[PDB]
Amino acid sequence: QCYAEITGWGKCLPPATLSNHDLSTFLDTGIEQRRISHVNTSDLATVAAQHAIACAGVSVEEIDLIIVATCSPDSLIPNIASRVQQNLGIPSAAAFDLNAAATGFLYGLETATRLMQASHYRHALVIGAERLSFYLDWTKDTAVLFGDGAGAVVLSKTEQKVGLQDAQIGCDAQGRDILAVPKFGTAFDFVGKEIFKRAVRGMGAAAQQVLARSGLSTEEIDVVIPHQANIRIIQTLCDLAGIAQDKAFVNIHRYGNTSAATVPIALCEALEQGKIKPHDDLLVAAFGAGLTWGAGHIRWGERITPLGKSDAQLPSCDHTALDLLS
Amino acid sequence: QCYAEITGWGKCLPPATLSNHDLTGIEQRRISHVNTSDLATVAAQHAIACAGVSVEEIDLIIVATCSPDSLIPNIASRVQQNLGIPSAAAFDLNAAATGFLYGLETATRLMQASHYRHALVIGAERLSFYLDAVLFGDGAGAVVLSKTEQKVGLQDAQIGCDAQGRDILAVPKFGTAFDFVGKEIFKRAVRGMGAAAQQVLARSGLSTEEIDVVIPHQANIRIIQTLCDLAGIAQDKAFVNIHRYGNTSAATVPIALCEALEQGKIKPHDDLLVAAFGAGLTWGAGHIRWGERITPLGKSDAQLPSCDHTALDLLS
């Protein structure tokens, strides 16, 4: 029996910051700020990956698998996992984009972990990355909700019982029409109340299943890394699960909802701020357009500090965030 | 130890046919009058009936495409909604034409390492959306996988990507942001698929003589011939339907597999070699050990909405 330990983590938040005050200028949550990228999604992903690689101390030749969870890719042909691969010079790895909306990163984590357990993948890079700013209708509720950013992890095969344990991922397809941008693709819809109910239900039931199969009580959960879409969803999810609200890591106020990137960014910050201790039990939970949903139980291993650090950074930004949206 | 048997197969080729005419290996392609999700849906319905599984038994839906109707939400969730499958994991995977093989690999390992008992893996494309040209068509192919103890379905696979070839095959300004270098695409494809096939064969302990059938990506007849010649595999073992449908990217393999079974090209316990490549440049190969059954348990009446248009008409 093999496991996929999370041995590296990293993030990339673009520098141009957009305050609510900045928003008041042109405009008539929990969120105070978001970032707005002056580069493509593949660039955000690349830098976050560089941080996780250095954090893990792995050589780029050791990576067998790159998954980019996104719903805002630079291009469809080719995918952007292959762009990240080209940028980092990783040779020969499997490389794909996965689209499960905000639950993408959890889907990716589940997928890479099972690939590693059943076959010959020794290290993996799983990245959540978005440039939601590309989508926004500056007239329309939606505009204040979303930001740009990337988060990444590196997974390394091991015999120790760590990394993702059980996961339960799914999709409530009867809710598909309540959250959509239907004419971008080869072809907004936003019903807040229904999104709310189905999200808490989907994430809730998924979390419960994971906990029950792991034999854990809510009390043995040390940290909750939820999708950062809405503070009230997070509070409600915990309240209904009976999980103390202090265990939930929240950074939505800083970055807004960055779809697939929220969980890996939160996870990276939680580690940097020492919120996660060696051998802690984490509960991850997320949902997204689809309506996709998921939860996972991660057992952390020995190390919560980077082996090294990267000098990787985005090209210098000559623009303000107000400037980027003009 | 668990395995993912291919217990259902099915396809959906849109009716409007486009012959070679004035206005590869290829004589015809199909041109869809519906979205990609619709092609995927019908192919799925055929596979479900072929497998005799109930829609409530499906735990996982993967749609390999690079021409989805929408990015938000994904189209796996649309297929799920159309078939009424409750609660399954549903995602879109983009690895260009190697998508279906990537999906097959992913679903198989999900099923072996965790609690997914049945899966639907679909390749589906509407490449006609992209064209500015005689090389591509539209279509979908699907399989259903069912967990079992018998040593059948995908055995070893080797998937990868040659990222130094990323720029030789691209539509770079569709997305949130044509390039086509035929000779380089040719060289890297044969190299990528070749090396992948070799690694799979070697790990499986097979000689090329024990391969019964080859289901390759249908992008170009000469690529297929060259891949076999260099592997030492007899060219007669390679199933080819490109002449009928053209290159339907992620859909080529599952359509070919489905037709190979319908035409009795595949026998119980046959060893299949799948191989594919795509923009990325992605590449992959897989060894499938077929089980007992090569006939559908049932048939579906599922069909696309009636087409009132000619294919010439559809491109206008």
mmCIF file with all atom_site columns, C-alpha atoms in Angstrom, chain B residues 184-302:
data_model
loop_
_atom_site.group_PDB
_atom_site.id
_atom_site.type_symbol
_atom_site.label_atom_id
_atom_site.label_alt_id
_atom_site.label_comp_id
_atom_site.label_asym_id
_atom_site.label_entity_id
_atom_site.label_seq_id
_atom_site.pdbx_PDB_ins_code
_atom_site.Cartn_x
_atom_site.Cartn_y
_atom_site.Cartn_z
_atom_site.occupancy
_atom_site.B_iso_or_equiv
_atom_site.pdbx_formal_charge
_atom_site.auth_seq_id
_atom_site.auth_comp_id
_atom_site.auth_asym_id
_atom_site.auth_atom_id
_atom_site.pdbx_PDB_model_num
ATOM 1   C CA . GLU B 1 184 ? 7.588   18.280  -36.689 1.00 0.00 ? 184 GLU B CA 1
ATOM 2   C CA . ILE B 1 185 ? 4.136   17.053  -35.649 1.00 0.00 ? 185 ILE B CA 1
ATOM 3   C CA . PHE B 1 186 ? 4.869   13.913  -37.643 1.00 0.00 ? 186 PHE B CA 1
ATOM 4   C CA . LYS B 1 187 ? 8.287   13.270  -36.086 1.00 0.00 ? 187 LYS B CA 1
ATOM 5   C CA . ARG B 1 188 ? 7.298   13.946  -32.489 1.00 0.00 ? 188 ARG B CA 1
ATOM 6   C CA . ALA B 1 189 ? 4.053   11.935  -32.742 1.00 0.00 ? 189 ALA B CA 1
ATOM 7   C CA . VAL B 1 190 ? 5.730   8.777   -33.981 1.00 0.00 ? 190 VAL B CA 1
ATOM 8   C CA . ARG B 1 191 ? 8.480   9.232   -31.380 1.00 0.00 ? 191 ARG B CA 1
ATOM 9   C CA . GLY B 1 192 ? 6.065   9.940   -28.535 1.00 0.00 ? 192 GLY B CA 1
ATOM 10  C CA . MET B 1 193 ? 3.558   7.215   -29.348 1.00 0.00 ? 193 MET B CA 1
ATOM 11  C CA . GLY B 1 194 ? 6.323   4.829   -30.302 1.00 0.00 ? 194 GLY B CA 1
ATOM 12  C CA . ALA B 1 195 ? 8.205   5.143   -27.076 1.00 0.00 ? 195 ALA B CA 1
ATOM 13  C CA . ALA B 1 196 ? 5.058   4.950   -25.018 1.00 0.00 ? 196 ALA B CA 1
ATOM 14  C CA . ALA B 1 197 ? 3.920   1.753   -26.822 1.00 0.00 ? 197 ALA B CA 1
ATOM 15  C CA . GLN B 1 198 ? 7.320   0.178   -26.330 1.00 0.00 ? 198 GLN B CA 1
ATOM 16  C CA . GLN B 1 199 ? 7.338   0.909   -22.581 1.00 0.00 ? 199 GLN B CA 1
ATOM 17  C CA . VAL B 1 200 ? 3.885   -0.591  -22.214 1.00 0.00 ? 200 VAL B CA 1
ATOM 18  C CA . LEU B 1 201 ? 4.758   -3.720  -24.182 1.00 0.00 ? 201 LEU B CA 1
ATOM 19  C CA . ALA B 1 202 ? 8.018   -4.254  -22.363 1.00 0.00 ? 202 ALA B CA 1
ATOM 20  C CA . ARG B 1 203 ? 6.407   -3.935  -18.910 1.00 0.00 ? 203 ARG B CA 1
ATOM 21  C CA . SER B 1 204 ? 3.621   -6.306  -19.869 1.00 0.00 ? 204 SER B CA 1
ATOM 22  C CA . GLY B 1 205 ? 6.140   -8.927  -21.025 1.00 0.00 ? 205 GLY B CA 1
ATOM 23  C CA . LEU B 1 206 ? 4.462   -9.201  -24.453 1.00 0.00 ? 206 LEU B CA 1
ATOM 24  C CA . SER B 1 207 ? 6.069   -9.796  -27.822 1.00 0.00 ? 207 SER B CA 1
ATOM 25  C CA . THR B 1 208 ? 4.689   -7.780  -30.738 1.00 0.00 ? 208 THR B CA 1
ATOM 26  C CA . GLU B 1 209 ? 3.360   -11.079 -32.115 1.00 0.00 ? 209 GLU B CA 1
ATOM 27  C CA . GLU B 1 210 ? 0.967   -11.480 -29.114 1.00 0.00 ? 210 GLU B CA 1
ATOM 28  C CA . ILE B 1 211 ? -0.720  -8.131  -29.873 1.00 0.00 ? 211 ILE B CA 1
ATOM 29  C CA . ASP B 1 212 ? -4.038  -8.966  -31.571 1.00 0.00 ? 212 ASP B CA 1
ATOM 30  C CA . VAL B 1 213 ? -5.295  -5.447  -32.410 1.00 0.00 ? 213 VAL B CA 1
ATOM 31  C CA . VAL B 1 214 ? -4.122  -1.862  -32.510 1.00 0.00 ? 214 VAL B CA 1
ATOM 32  C CA . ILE B 1 215 ? -6.497  1.005   -31.912 1.00 0.00 ? 215 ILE B CA 1
ATOM 33  C CA . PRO B 1 216 ? -4.558  4.111   -32.800 1.00 0.00 ? 216 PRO B CA 1
ATOM 34  C CA . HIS B 1 217 ? -5.439  7.794   -32.944 1.00 0.00 ? 217 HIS B CA 1
ATOM 35  C CA . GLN B 1 218 ? -6.830  8.429   -36.403 1.00 0.00 ? 218 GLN B CA 1
ATOM 36  C CA . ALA B 1 219 ? -4.991  11.649  -37.366 1.00 0.00 ? 219 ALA B CA 1
ATOM 37  C CA . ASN B 1 220 ? -3.047  10.430  -40.327 1.00 0.00 ? 220 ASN B CA 1
ATOM 38  C CA . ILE B 1 221 ? -2.707  7.100   -42.122 1.00 0.00 ? 221 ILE B CA 1
ATOM 39  C CA . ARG B 1 222 ? 1.070   7.435   -42.604 1.00 0.00 ? 222 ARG B CA 1
ATOM 40  C CA . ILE B 1 223 ? 1.594   8.031   -38.866 1.00 0.00 ? 223 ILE B CA 1
ATOM 41  C CA . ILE B 1 224 ? -0.274  4.803   -38.139 1.00 0.00 ? 224 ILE B CA 1
ATOM 42  C CA . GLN B 1 225 ? 1.737   2.856   -40.726 1.00 0.00 ? 225 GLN B CA 1
ATOM 43  C CA . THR B 1 226 ? 5.022   4.291   -39.516 1.00 0.00 ? 226 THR B CA 1
ATOM 44  C CA . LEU B 1 227 ? 4.170   3.593   -35.841 1.00 0.00 ? 227 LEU B CA 1
ATOM 45  C CA . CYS B 1 228 ? 3.495   -0.072  -36.634 1.00 0.00 ? 228 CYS B CA 1
ATOM 46  C CA . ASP B 1 229 ? 6.453   -0.514  -39.013 1.00 0.00 ? 229 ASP B CA 1
ATOM 47  C CA . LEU B 1 230 ? 8.879   0.867   -36.386 1.00 0.00 ? 230 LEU B CA 1
ATOM 48  C CA . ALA B 1 231 ? 7.297   -1.189  -33.608 1.00 0.00 ? 231 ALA B CA 1
ATOM 49  C CA . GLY B 1 232 ? 7.409   -4.319  -35.844 1.00 0.00 ? 232 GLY B CA 1
ATOM 50  C CA . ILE B 1 233 ? 3.644   -4.749  -35.597 1.00 0.00 ? 233 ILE B CA 1
ATOM 51  C CA . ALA B 1 234 ? 1.796   -6.054  -38.640 1.00 0.00 ? 234 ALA B CA 1
ATOM 52  C CA . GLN B 1 235 ? -0.139  -3.202  -40.327 1.00 0.00 ? 235 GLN B CA 1
ATOM 53  C CA . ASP B 1 236 ? -3.210  -5.516  -40.766 1.00 0.00 ? 236 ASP B CA 1
ATOM 54  C CA . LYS B 1 237 ? -3.678  -5.464  -36.925 1.00 0.00 ? 237 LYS B CA 1
ATOM 55  C CA . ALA B 1 238 ? -4.341  -1.693  -36.912 1.00 0.00 ? 238 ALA B CA 1
ATOM 56  C CA . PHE B 1 239 ? -7.986  -0.705  -37.110 1.00 0.00 ? 239 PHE B CA 1
ATOM 57  C CA . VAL B 1 240 ? -8.510  2.291   -39.394 1.00 0.00 ? 240 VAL B CA 1
ATOM 58  C CA . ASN B 1 241 ? -11.729 4.301   -39.862 1.00 0.00 ? 241 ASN B CA 1
ATOM 59  C CA . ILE B 1 242 ? -10.252 7.730   -40.622 1.00 0.00 ? 242 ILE B CA 1
ATOM 60  C CA . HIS B 1 243 ? -11.515 7.582   -44.211 1.00 0.00 ? 243 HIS B CA 1
ATOM 61  C CA . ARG B 1 244 ? -15.106 7.685   -42.939 1.00 0.00 ? 244 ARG B CA 1
ATOM 62  C CA . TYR B 1 245 ? -14.858 10.332  -40.123 1.00 0.00 ? 245 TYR B CA 1
ATOM 63  C CA . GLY B 1 246 ? -11.555 12.197  -40.336 1.00 0.00 ? 246 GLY B CA 1
ATOM 64  C CA . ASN B 1 247 ? -9.682  13.236  -37.172 1.00 0.00 ? 247 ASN B CA 1
ATOM 65  C CA . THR B 1 248 ? -12.144 13.735  -34.348 1.00 0.00 ? 248 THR B CA 1
ATOM 66  C CA . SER B 1 249 ? -9.421  14.377  -31.709 1.00 0.00 ? 249 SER B CA 1
ATOM 67  C CA . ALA B 1 250 ? -10.370 12.755  -28.324 1.00 0.00 ? 250 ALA B CA 1
ATOM 68  C CA . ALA B 1 251 ? -13.152 10.768  -29.975 1.00 0.00 ? 251 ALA B CA 1
ATOM 69  C CA . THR B 1 252 ? -11.076 8.789   -32.467 1.00 0.00 ? 252 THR B CA 1
ATOM 70  C CA . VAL B 1 253 ? -10.063 5.929   -30.184 1.00 0.00 ? 253 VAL B CA 1
ATOM 71  C CA . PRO B 1 254 ? -13.452 5.184   -28.574 1.00 0.00 ? 254 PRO B CA 1
ATOM 72  C CA . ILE B 1 255 ? -15.223 5.403   -31.953 1.00 0.00 ? 255 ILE B CA 1
ATOM 73  C CA . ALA B 1 256 ? -12.591 3.085   -33.478 1.00 0.00 ? 256 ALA B CA 1
ATOM 74  C CA . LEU B 1 257 ? -12.856 0.683   -30.522 1.00 0.00 ? 257 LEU B CA 1
ATOM 75  C CA . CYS B 1 258 ? -16.630 0.598   -30.783 1.00 0.00 ? 258 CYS B CA 1
ATOM 76  C CA . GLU B 1 259 ? -16.549 -0.073  -34.562 1.00 0.00 ? 259 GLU B CA 1
ATOM 77  C CA . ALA B 1 260 ? -13.830 -2.657  -34.149 1.00 0.00 ? 260 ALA B CA 1
ATOM 78  C CA . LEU B 1 261 ? -16.125 -4.565  -31.802 1.00 0.00 ? 261 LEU B CA 1
ATOM 79  C CA . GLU B 1 262 ? -19.212 -4.151  -34.070 1.00 0.00 ? 262 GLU B CA 1
ATOM 80  C CA . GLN B 1 263 ? -17.150 -5.471  -37.016 1.00 0.00 ? 263 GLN B CA 1
ATOM 81  C CA . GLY B 1 264 ? -15.896 -8.454  -34.926 1.00 0.00 ? 264 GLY B CA 1
ATOM 82  C CA . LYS B 1 265 ? -12.252 -7.339  -35.211 1.00 0.00 ? 265 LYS B CA 1
ATOM 83  C CA . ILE B 1 266 ? -11.806 -8.034  -31.483 1.00 0.00 ? 266 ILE B CA 1
ATOM 84  C CA . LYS B 1 267 ? -12.103 -11.471 -29.868 1.00 0.00 ? 267 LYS B CA 1
ATOM 85  C CA . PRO B 1 268 ? -12.565 -12.443 -26.162 1.00 0.00 ? 268 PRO B CA 1
ATOM 86  C CA . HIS B 1 269 ? -9.185  -12.306 -24.301 1.00 0.00 ? 269 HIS B CA 1
ATOM 87  C CA . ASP B 1 270 ? -7.497  -10.369 -27.165 1.00 0.00 ? 270 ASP B CA 1
ATOM 88  C CA . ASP B 1 271 ? -4.549  -8.072  -26.322 1.00 0.00 ? 271 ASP B CA 1
ATOM 89  C CA . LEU B 1 272 ? -5.179  -4.564  -27.624 1.00 0.00 ? 272 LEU B CA 1
ATOM 90  C CA . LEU B 1 273 ? -2.654  -1.826  -28.008 1.00 0.00 ? 273 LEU B CA 1
ATOM 91  C CA . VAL B 1 274 ? -4.082  1.671   -27.855 1.00 0.00 ? 274 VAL B CA 1
ATOM 92  C CA . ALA B 1 275 ? -1.977  4.626   -28.833 1.00 0.00 ? 275 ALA B CA 1
ATOM 93  C CA . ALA B 1 276 ? -2.572  8.321   -29.339 1.00 0.00 ? 276 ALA B CA 1
ATOM 94  C CA . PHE B 1 277 ? -1.071  11.790  -29.454 1.00 0.00 ? 277 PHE B CA 1
ATOM 95  C CA . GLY B 1 278 ? -2.329  15.342  -29.599 1.00 0.00 ? 278 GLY B CA 1
ATOM 96  C CA . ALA B 1 279 ? -1.537  19.018  -29.190 1.00 0.00 ? 279 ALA B CA 1
ATOM 97  C CA . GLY B 1 280 ? 0.764   19.486  -26.180 1.00 0.00 ? 280 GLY B CA 1
ATOM 98  C CA . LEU B 1 281 ? 2.312   17.505  -27.632 1.00 0.00 ? 281 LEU B CA 1
ATOM 99  C CA . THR B 1 282 ? 0.541   14.884  -25.510 1.00 0.00 ? 282 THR B CA 1
ATOM 100 C CA . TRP B 1 283 ? 1.077   11.207  -26.110 1.00 0.00 ? 283 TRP B CA 1
ATOM 101 C CA . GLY B 1 284 ? 0.146   7.865   -24.745 1.00 0.00 ? 284 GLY B CA 1
ATOM 102 C CA . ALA B 1 285 ? -0.241  4.170   -25.054 1.00 0.00 ? 285 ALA B CA 1
ATOM 103 C CA . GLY B 1 286 ? -2.101  1.419   -23.235 1.00 0.00 ? 286 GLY B CA 1
ATOM 104 C CA . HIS B 1 287 ? -2.443  -2.327  -23.164 1.00 0.00 ? 287 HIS B CA 1
ATOM 105 C CA . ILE B 1 288 ? -5.972  -3.622  -22.728 1.00 0.00 ? 288 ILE B CA 1
ATOM 106 C CA . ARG B 1 289 ? -6.718  -7.237  -22.008 1.00 0.00 ? 289 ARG B CA 1
ATOM 107 C CA . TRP B 1 290 ? -10.214 -7.934  -23.260 1.00 0.00 ? 290 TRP B CA 1
ATOM 108 C CA . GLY B 1 291 ? -12.598 -10.064 -21.184 1.00 0.00 ? 291 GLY B CA 1
ATOM 109 C CA . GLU B 1 292 ? -15.390 -12.506 -22.118 1.00 0.00 ? 292 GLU B CA 1
ATOM 110 C CA . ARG B 1 293 ? -17.943 -10.327 -23.936 1.00 0.00 ? 293 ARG B CA 1
ATOM 111 C CA . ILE B 1 294 ? -17.690 -8.439  -27.280 1.00 0.00 ? 294 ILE B CA 1
ATOM 112 C CA . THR B 1 295 ? -21.474 -8.076  -27.845 1.00 0.00 ? 295 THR B CA 1
ATOM 113 C CA . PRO B 1 296 ? -23.942 -5.503  -26.386 1.00 0.00 ? 296 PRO B CA 1
ATOM 114 C CA . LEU B 1 297 ? -26.348 -6.716  -23.686 1.00 0.00 ? 297 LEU B CA 1
ATOM 115 C CA . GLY B 1 298 ? -28.826 -4.289  -25.177 1.00 0.00 ? 298 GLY B CA 1
ATOM 116 C CA . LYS B 1 299 ? -29.278 -1.514  -27.737 1.00 0.00 ? 299 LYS B CA 1
ATOM 117 C CA . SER B 1 300 ? -30.431 2.095   -27.255 1.00 0.00 ? 300 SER B CA 1
ATOM 118 C CA . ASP B 1 301 ? -32.991 4.028   -29.264 1.00 0.00 ? 301 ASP B CA 1
ATOM 119 C CA . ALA B 1 302 ? -31.071 7.218   -28.373 1.00 0.00 ? 302 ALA B CA 1
#
